Amino acid sequence: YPIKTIVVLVQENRSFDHTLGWFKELNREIDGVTKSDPKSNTVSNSLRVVFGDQSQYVNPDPGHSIQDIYEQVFGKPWDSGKPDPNPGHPNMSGFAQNAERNKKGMSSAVMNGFKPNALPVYKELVQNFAICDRWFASVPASTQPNRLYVHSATSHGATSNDAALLLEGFPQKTIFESLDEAGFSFGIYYQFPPSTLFYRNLRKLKYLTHFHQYGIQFKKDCKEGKLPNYVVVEQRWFDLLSTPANDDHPSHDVSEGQKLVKEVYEALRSSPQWNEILFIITYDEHGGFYDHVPTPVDGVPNPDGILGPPPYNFEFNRLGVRVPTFFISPWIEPGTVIHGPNGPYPRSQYEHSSIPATVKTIFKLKDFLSKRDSWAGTFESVITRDSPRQDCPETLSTPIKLRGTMAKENAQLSEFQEDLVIMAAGLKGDYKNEELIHKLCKETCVADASKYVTNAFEKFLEESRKARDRGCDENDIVY
Amino acid sequence: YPIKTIVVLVQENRSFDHTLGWFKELNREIDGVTKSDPKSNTVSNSLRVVFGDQSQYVNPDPGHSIQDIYEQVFGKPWDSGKPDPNPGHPNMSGFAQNAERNKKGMSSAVMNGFKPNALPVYKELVQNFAICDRWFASVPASTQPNRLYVHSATSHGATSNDAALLLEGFPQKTIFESLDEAGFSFGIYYQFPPSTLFYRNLRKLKYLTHFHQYGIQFKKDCKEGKLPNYVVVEQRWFDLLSTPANDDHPSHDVSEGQKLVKEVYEALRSSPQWNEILFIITYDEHGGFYDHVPTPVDGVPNPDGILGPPPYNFEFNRLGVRVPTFFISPWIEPGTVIHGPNGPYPRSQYEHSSIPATVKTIFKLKDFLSKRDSWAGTFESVITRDSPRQDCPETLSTPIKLRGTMAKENAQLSEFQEDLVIMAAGLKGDYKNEELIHKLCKETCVADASKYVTNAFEKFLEESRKARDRGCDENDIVY
Ligand SMILES: [Ca+2]
Ligand SMILES: [Ca+2]
């Protein structure tokens, strides 16, 4: 098997239709959207909102909590006094209604997708490599549970961005540990204190050495062919005037995400390891933007038997919304579209747990991590060529600035930013300082919060390095 | 949509570079040629033949059979004992070598293009309307397969000018039938017994009424604004001293083709239907003249699953050579250059099948004819204006006649002329007559053969008229 290096990049809050649905103009096999027979949702006197291609580079932030996504997929709001966790008929009819409930007029942005030319990096990559148009988010919930699934095939009961749980760190076994036990290498290249540190086990001294600053190490390791077997690229989630976020989370400029993907792809393409690389791009969840494919509700297993917190008490028996997923490798036929899986079970689906599962399949790891990656589809069959393609694009099209626009910066911390701030302050003991934590979470600007997070993270790394130099046990966490 | 009338003219045997490559002087956006960084081919001690701009109005006849074009595109001769049908990436390095193989010294004419001033009509048109510099002939083969593709999106396995197959008529469904089934009108205006009667279905009594003599009917229907929805103009392929061929087929005077295009354009421009007209000019294939753009060999589908005849057993998995293609309409911006398509598939290309595919797209016909037009790019997006131009040229530059030159006329029948003679003789039963068909094909002058063809075709039309007057069924063919 030719794949010895697997790269993973997880962007933020975009549905498959919203991002790639108008790419059906460029490949009829893509389960996207059309203008002649368009998709639509109804807002309730009653209005029909048709799915169009007028998405802008800066968008409002639709609802993407478990309750919002419940309304989006089932077409009726959640009612904690009349809890209906398994209504049965996911018709994807509530996106516009939930959008209007969250913010008047937002159903326009929720029911819009991008023109392919507005995402030229994605245009070239889709036309030259592979995508999956049946890849669902692991959880019909927010950011962090899905991100936990990406590298652990579970969220350990989490259905929200509970900052206390993330500060404590999630204790489940990760794919990094499976790889390390099987004798394989891994590395996390971060542009900012990364979300993978929400895994408790990655905070051990033996695994902190696998973290490397992006910019110092990434392009270097690409150039000299020293990339590990499993490389994770983590980006910037704080949106500052001095440094824009590049994670595609709404209100952030998606052109910055295009630039990030361009840079990563071009670094991997010129690497001596290009002929042994499989590069996977996905989105943690759909961000509340519309998609027409009903979320699977049948035969979806709970990964570990842990239920979600009240009032929802989520059983993890239904998947999230379709997200854009890209497979990039010289061993892939250009223009390939992967649909649903063939096994390992009749109700198997492609989802975030497909990444550990497939990793387990490619490196012949002993065990699955949970019931989810044991049940999820594996996409190793996307590697079909007898020899690697030699005329893959070396440089991708440049994202171009719009004329006469103005840069943006959020006033209040987003949930991701607040999660990182609360983790930083729990490491520093400022969390037990009640008024300091309230000031940090509610009364500091985003630039100050980013500085606080970077300072706390650098301090934690300093302490871990000193502990490792003292001869402390490999397996200990510094705090 | 403003286009209600589509007019089509197909000239003979010119490559894009040979005809319009020096037009890059007039529009830098054209993927043509230059003198500072010129194209070249090698002839084997080795010689370098540089592409120049010294084409004359009368040229030798380069090789344009499937084997000749194989050598031209792949840079090595075909070998029926060592058949290598898919050798890989075409480098377009064999034009001069194949030219010298066919006739000593012919690489000069093959490696030459026209000065723009030598084609004034085209010049004006190119600067006042649109061209496509990524429009490939449907087949890397001779005349008739490509012409079959023009109006049917397939050649039904044909890769040669097999006169028996053309006499029998090709039975595939045509764009004419698609239009007639949807209630749309069509008309074929012929200056000579036309090549569209190589389609068997057009020989039915119900469709023979759609054929009109050009001199009688074309300018009349243009003036009275009674042009049907789909208009095909067919010209003269016999080159007589008393009546020159105007199809631009080599050894014929290209100035006559310029005159023909001028006449057709002026008849359409002064028509009341000018504001609803889209006029397409193309060439059936490249004639063996040089071009630098590699022929697409990836993702090209066989239209109907039929293989070419031995020894080549062509799979129809690679396209022919770039040809000049003009889009003319008051709704088109002047000086426009169309490149490759955007869909419907990642490896889609512009080719002759783009004409039916676009027709189906403009008139909203139910079905494509084959996999080719289902896959070919469509160019309805060339119609961009909000209102039709009013200052389009009313008359085009006159083509000048060089002083001191003499007229030309071939001795032996060309393959096109022999095809028409054999069709005429098969209709009359003269093909049964061995000695008489040998006499007609090898022993009669071109004027006598032209008269024979016209007589046979007029008597065929006479018998069809008599049959229709008997009350014969609409769908029958007279023989
Ligand atoms: Ca998210
Ligand atoms: Ca020809």
Side-chain angles (χ1 to χ4, degrees):
Chain A
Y1 201 73
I3 304 303
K4 308 143 92 282
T5 297
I6 290 170
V7 190
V8 176
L9 171 64
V10 182
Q11 297 290 89
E12 286 288 308
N13 292 49
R14 303 288 161 162
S15 80
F16 184 96
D17 275 347
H18 168 77
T19 309
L20 301 180
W22 300 106
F23 285 49
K24 191 177 178 80
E25 310 146 28
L26 311 173
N27 188 349
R28 197 181 289 148
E29 274 300 297
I30 294 172
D31 188 14
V33 302
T34 64
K35 301 233 165 91
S36 60
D37 195 38
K39 312 300 184 188
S40 63
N41 267 193
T42 290
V43 175
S44 275
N45 233 29
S46 179
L47 306 174
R48 182 174 172 246
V49 190
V50 176
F51 189 77
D53 63 353
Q54 282 323 308
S55 290
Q56 311 294 311
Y57 294 112
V58 172
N59 329 91
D61 191 7
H64 48 278
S65 66
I66 181 170
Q67 57 269 21
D68 291 313
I69 299 165
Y70 178 95
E71 181 175 21
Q72 292 158 17
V73 303
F74 293 120
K76 70 200 191 86
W78 172 270
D79 188 343
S80 286
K82 305 286 211 294
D84 195 11
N86 310 297
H89 284 91
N91 54 13
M92 314 309 270
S93 62
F95 285 92
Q97 191 74 50
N98 180 257
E100 290 298 314
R101 186 188 308 281
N102 275 280
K103 170 160 168 142
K104 177 169 163 65
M106 190 169 54
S107 68
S108 278
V110 159
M111 310 291 303
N112 261 328
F114 278 97
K115 293 181 150 71
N117 277 352
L119 303 172
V121 172
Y122 280 170
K123 186 177 178 188
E124 214 177 334
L125 286 169
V126 167
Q127 288 317 61
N128 281 270
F129 296 105
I131 65 175
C132 180
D133 65 359
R134 287 274 181 291
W135 187 295
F136 304 91
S138 295
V139 201
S142 62
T143 290
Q144 299 310 331
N146 282 290
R147 281 188 172 274
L148 294 171
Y149 267 86
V150 169
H151 303 293
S152 78
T154 184
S155 74
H156 200 79
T159 59
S160 78
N161 301 322
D162 190 345
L165 301 183
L166 302 158
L167 162 58
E168 291 298 325
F170 281 78
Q172 66 261 28
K173 193 179 159 142
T174 60
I175 189 72
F176 310 105
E177 295 157 86
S178 292
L179 292 158
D180 187 59
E181 291 164 7
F184 294 96
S185 54
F186 73 92
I188 294 144
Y189 302 81
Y190 61 98
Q191 306 182 334
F192 193 81
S195 68
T196 35
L197 280 179
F198 295 145
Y199 295 118
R200 179 169 182 290
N201 295 333
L202 287 186
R203 307 175 177 181
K204 299 174 170 169
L205 313 184
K206 70 208 239 203
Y207 290 137
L208 282 174
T209 59
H210 299 251
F211 289 80
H212 318 287
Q213 278 198 1
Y214 188 109
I216 288 183
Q217 209 58 48
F218 181 72
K219 266 147 163 198
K220 195 163 176 313
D221 290 349
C222 281
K223 177 166 181 46
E224 29 189 289
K226 295 294 119 162
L227 285 178
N229 294 126
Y230 188 65
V231 6
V232 179
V233 176
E234 297 231 56
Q235 66 284 66
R236 309 187 300 258
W237 309 281
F238 281 78
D239 198 30
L240 304 191
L241 301 176
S242 62
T243 165
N246 53 4
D247 63 349
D248 292 340
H249 196 291
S251 280
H252 307 164
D253 192 347
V254 299
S255 287
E256 292 304 317
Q258 294 289 283
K259 286 183 238 192
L260 169 64
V261 170
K262 168 174 159 80
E263 181 180 279
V264 170
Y265 167 82
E266 279 169 10
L268 300 177
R269 168 76 177 75
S270 61
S271 170
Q273 285 170 289
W274 170 234
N275 285 331
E276 67 180 40
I277 273 161
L278 174 53
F279 179 31
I280 301 132
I281 307 168
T282 196
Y283 283 71
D284 60 345
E285 37 71 11
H286 66 297
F289 294 96
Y290 173 82
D291 195 75
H292 71 272
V293 175
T295 56
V297 297
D298 301 297
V300 174
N302 185 307
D304 49 19
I306 306 175
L307 295 179
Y312 315 104
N313 304 307
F314 190 55
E315 307 156 79
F316 296 95
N317 59 350
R318 51 176 183 102
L319 296 185
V321 179
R322 268 201 323 169
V323 289
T325 294
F326 310 75
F327 311 118
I328 295 151
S329 176
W331 297 88
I332 289 172
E333 271 328 303
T336 299
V337 182
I338 303 301
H339 305 300
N342 284 290
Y345 290 108
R347 300 269 194 196
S348 290
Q349 306 281 352
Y350 285 125
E351 60 140 276
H352 293 331
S353 307
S354 300
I355 292 171
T358 302
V359 164
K360 184 258 201 203
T361 300
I362 281 167
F363 293 122
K364 316 150 163 173
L365 309 184
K366 184 39 163 13
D367 294 309
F368 292 112
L369 298 163
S370 76
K371 300 284 165 143
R372 269 293 177 96
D373 60 330
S374 182
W375 159 96
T378 62
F379 54 90
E380 78 277 11
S381 84
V382 77
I383 305 296
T384 65
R385 285 194 47 110
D386 296 322
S387 49
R389 209 202 322 167
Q390 293 179 258
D391 51 339
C392 293
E394 332 202 315
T395 58
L396 306 179
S397 303
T398 320
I400 270 250
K401 168 214 266 229
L402 276 190
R403 222 182 276 155
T405 51
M406 170 257 281
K408 294 278 172 192
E409 177 177 299
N410 46 318
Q412 322 310 157
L413 300 166
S414 73
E415 280 200 355
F416 207 141
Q417 291 148 18
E418 197 183 326
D419 287 338
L420 289 162
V421 160
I422 277 158
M423 181 164 142
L427 297 177
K428 292 199 30 155
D430 296 277
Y431 196 81
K432 76 201 154 94
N433 190 346
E434 80 176 59
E435 269 220 298
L436 183 36
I437 209 68
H438 179 269
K439 158 188 314 306
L440 277 169
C441 297
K442 309 284 123 189
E443 283 167 320
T444 86
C445 61
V446 285
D448 267 3
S450 169
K451 190 45 167 196
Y452 182 81
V453 170
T454 50
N455 282 344
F457 170 64
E458 275 138 38
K459 198 175 209 93
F460 165 85
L461 248 62
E462 190 36 58
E463 283 308 311
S464 302
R465 268 49 155 142
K466 307 205 298 233
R468 185 181 307 108
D469 294 357
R470 297 201 301 261
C472 284
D473 171 11
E474 251 196 349
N475 266 282
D476 281 70
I477 299 152
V478 81
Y479 56 66
Chain B
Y1 204 75
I3 304 302
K4 288 153 72 153
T5 292
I6 293 173
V7 187
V8 175
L9 174 62
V10 177
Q11 297 290 94
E12 287 291 306
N13 297 46
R14 304 287 161 160
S15 84
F16 185 93
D17 279 344
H18 166 78
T19 308
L20 300 180
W22 297 109
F23 285 48
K24 191 180 178 83
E25 301 149 31
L26 307 173
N27 187 348
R28 196 178 289 152
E29 269 289 302
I30 297 172
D31 186 12
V33 300
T34 63
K35 291 231 182 64
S36 59
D37 198 56
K39 311 300 183 189
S40 65
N41 266 194
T42 54
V43 176
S44 309
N45 175 71
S46 211
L47 300 177
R48 178 157 171 272
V49 190
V50 176
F51 191 72
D53 63 356
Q54 297 299 342
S55 292
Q56 312 294 296
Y57 294 121
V58 169
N59 324 94
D61 190 4
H64 47 280
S65 67
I66 181 170
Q67 55 268 26
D68 293 314
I69 297 162
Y70 179 98
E71 181 172 18
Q72 291 158 17
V73 301
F74 296 119
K76 68 197 193 82
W78 173 266
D79 190 339
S80 289
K82 305 289 211 290
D84 187 22
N86 313 298
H89 295 82
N91 53 17
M92 320 295 279
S93 64
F95 286 90
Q97 189 71 48
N98 182 252
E100 292 298 313
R101 184 188 307 284
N102 275 284
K103 180 191 176 155
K104 176 165 161 56
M106 174 144 92
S107 63
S108 277
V110 161
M111 302 306 279
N112 261 327
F114 281 99
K115 292 177 171 54
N117 278 348
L119 306 176
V121 174
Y122 279 172
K123 186 181 191 185
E124 190 150 12
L125 290 165
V126 166
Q127 303 290 80
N128 284 268
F129 298 101
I131 62 167
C132 178
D133 65 359
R134 287 270 179 298
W135 185 295
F136 302 90
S138 296
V139 199
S142 220
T143 291
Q144 302 305 336
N146 282 290
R147 273 179 180 283
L148 291 170
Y149 267 86
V150 170
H151 306 292
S152 80
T154 184
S155 73
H156 201 77
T159 62
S160 75
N161 301 326
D162 189 351
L165 301 190
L166 302 158
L167 163 60
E168 291 298 326
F170 281 77
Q172 62 260 31
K173 197 179 159 143
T174 61
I175 191 70
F176 310 106
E177 295 157 85
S178 286
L179 294 154
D180 186 65
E181 288 163 5
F184 294 97
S185 56
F186 73 91
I188 295 143
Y189 299 82
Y190 63 95
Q191 303 185 329
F192 193 82
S195 69
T196 36
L197 280 181
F198 295 146
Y199 294 117
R200 179 168 182 288
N201 294 332
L202 290 181
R203 307 175 178 183
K204 300 176 170 170
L205 306 178
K206 70 205 245 201
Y207 291 135
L208 281 174
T209 55
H210 298 247
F211 287 78
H212 318 287
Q213 286 201 1
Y214 177 96
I216 297 175
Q217 208 61 51
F218 180 71
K219 275 190 183 157
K220 194 187 176 80
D221 285 350
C222 283
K223 181 67 158 151
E224 304 181 7
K226 302 302 181 133
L227 286 178
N229 293 120
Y230 191 60
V231 174
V232 173
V233 172
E234 296 230 56
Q235 65 283 71
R236 310 188 300 260
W237 310 280
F238 278 83
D239 196 30
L240 305 194
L241 299 176
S242 56
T243 162
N246 50 8
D247 62 347
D248 289 344
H249 197 293
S251 281
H252 308 163
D253 193 347
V254 177
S255 288
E256 292 303 315
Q258 296 289 284
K259 289 190 220 182
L260 167 65
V261 172
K262 167 173 159 83
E263 178 181 281
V264 169
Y265 167 85
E266 281 172 11
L268 302 173
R269 167 78 182 77
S270 62
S271 174
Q273 284 170 290
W274 170 235
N275 283 339
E276 71 185 36
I277 272 161
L278 175 54
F279 177 30
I280 299 130
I281 303 171
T282 196
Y283 284 70
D284 59 347
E285 46 59 39
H286 67 296
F289 295 97
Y290 174 82
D291 194 76
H292 72 273
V293 173
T295 60
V297 299
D298 307 300
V300 176
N302 184 306
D304 47 20
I306 306 174
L307 293 180
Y312 315 103
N313 303 307
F314 188 53
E315 297 153 274
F316 296 95
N317 58 349
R318 55 184 179 91
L319 295 183
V321 177
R322 268 203 321 168
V323 291
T325 294
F326 307 77
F327 312 119
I328 293 156
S329 184
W331 297 88
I332 290 170
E333 282 295 307
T336 291
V337 180
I338 307 301
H339 302 306
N342 283 294
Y345 292 106
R347 303 272 207 183
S348 289
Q349 307 281 349
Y350 284 125
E351 61 142 280
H352 296 329
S353 301
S354 297
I355 291 171
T358 303
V359 166
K360 185 258 200 201
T361 299
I362 280 162
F363 294 116
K364 302 142 154 263
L365 304 184
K366 184 31 164 13
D367 294 304
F368 292 109
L369 298 166
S370 76
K371 305 286 198 24
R372 270 293 176 96
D373 58 334
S374 173
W375 160 94
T378 62
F379 55 90
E380 80 284 343
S381 86
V382 77
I383 305 294
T384 62
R385 271 186 65 101
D386 298 319
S387 56
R389 278 150 74 197
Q390 321 201 54
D391 60 335
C392 291
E394 290 181 32
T395 72
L396 302 180
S397 311
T398 201
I400 226 40
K401 166 118 183 98
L402 301 182
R403 286 194 127 202
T405 78
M406 314 228 83
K408 296 294 172 173
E409 166 175 307
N410 56 296
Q412 274 50 59
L413 299 164
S414 71
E415 277 198 352
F416 207 142
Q417 289 149 19
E418 214 203 338
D419 289 335
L420 291 164
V421 159
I422 275 157
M423 192 177 73
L427 292 174
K428 270 175 58 95
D430 293 72
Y431 201 87
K432 303 165 165 183
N433 194 346
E434 208 91 49
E435 245 195 308
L436 167 48
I437 199 49
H438 176 267
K439 176 183 289 293
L440 281 173
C441 293
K442 307 284 117 179
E443 295 176 20
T444 87
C445 60
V446 291
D448 271 8
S450 170
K451 193 59 172 158
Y452 179 83
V453 170
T454 53
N455 284 347
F457 174 65
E458 280 148 11
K459 162 172 316 221
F460 165 82
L461 283 187
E462 201 27 67
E463 297 296 313
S464 302
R465 202 199 38 119
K466 299 207 271 243
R468 193 193 292 109
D469 292 345
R470 311 202 265 280
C472 269
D473 166 28
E474 227 191 8
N475 256 272
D476 286 71
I477 299 160
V478 74
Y479 55 66

